[PDB]
Amino acid sequence: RPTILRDGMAADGVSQRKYNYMRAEQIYRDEQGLSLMPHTAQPILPAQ
């Protein structure tokens, strides 16, 4: 599947859905915490 990227709106769309999708999966690795220590921060991506 090719996908051309025009401007900052296109990389906004694709890079936003990939970046916030993977960050969202790390949030699903944050709520689903470790079995031993709840007081340990998971590696999470930055805000924006």
Binding site: G8, A11, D12, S15, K18, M22, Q42, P43
Partner: protein
């Protein structure tokens, strides 16, 4: 994993492989070789290092249930795994001046003529500043890692890519990635008495394998 292995000493055996991970024939042979012999004059209790090898790489719950002289060797195990790796190298060049970075090692790689080969997190960029405050980059990244095994020589694992992107002034752009996703199933019945809806479950060695692995490279 799961597995039920019946065995009688005089009436045959029911074993399986690849999903129960321990046959009743090999384990019964090892334990049959494990009970000590007697002498004429001393009796040596030293017949071992066969269970110590057969049970060396093994993580399953293996109980032995005797019922009517039928050693119901039940094997079962379930083990989850979860890795999470975040790495972020950084560099500071000028315009149109290439520069790289490394935190790796130097491993002796033999070619016939041993040659030193570099591994580890490399990031070779050559940025160019385009007008409108856009940045064109020629990025040749690599994440190498020494894997073991060691068949004839040491093996590596590379994750390199050599692309050319055009990002904005401070905005992220996705370069590459890999969203791996697997599955698996290996059931091993006994043909007629395997699909019994009630007690048929203790005849099949139902394996499974679920695996999922994501990967991204941003800038």
């Amino acid at each position: 994993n799961f597995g039920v292995q019946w065995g009688s000493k005089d009436a045959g055996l029911m074993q399986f492989a690849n999903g129960t991970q321990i046959p009743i024939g090999t384990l019964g042979a090892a334990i049959s070789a494990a009970k000590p012999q007697k002498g004429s004059n001393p009796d040596t209790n030293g017949d071992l290092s066969t269970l110590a090898q057969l049970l060396s790489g093994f993580s399953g719950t293996a109980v032995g249930v005797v019922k009517g002289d039928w050693m119901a060797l039940v094997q079962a195990v379930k083990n989850d795994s979860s890795s999470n790796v975040l790495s972020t190298p950084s560099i500071t060049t000028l315009d149109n001046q290439e520069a790289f970075f490394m935190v790796g090692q130097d491993v002796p790689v033999l070619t016939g003529t041993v040659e030193r080969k570099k591994v580890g997190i490399m990031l070779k960029v050559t940025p160019q500043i385009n007008e409108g405050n856009a940045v064109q980059m020629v990025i040749e990244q690599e994440v190498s890692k020494v894997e073991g095994q060691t068949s004839l020589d040491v093996v590596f694992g590379e994750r390199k890519l050599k692309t050319t992107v055009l990002a904005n002034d401070g905005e992220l752009i996705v370069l590459g990635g890999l969203m791996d996703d697997q599955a698996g199933e290996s059931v091993a019945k006994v043909p007629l008495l395997g699909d019994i809806p009630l007690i048929g479950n203790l005849f099949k060695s139902t394996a499974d394998k679920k695996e999922k692995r994501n990967l991204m490279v941003f800038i």
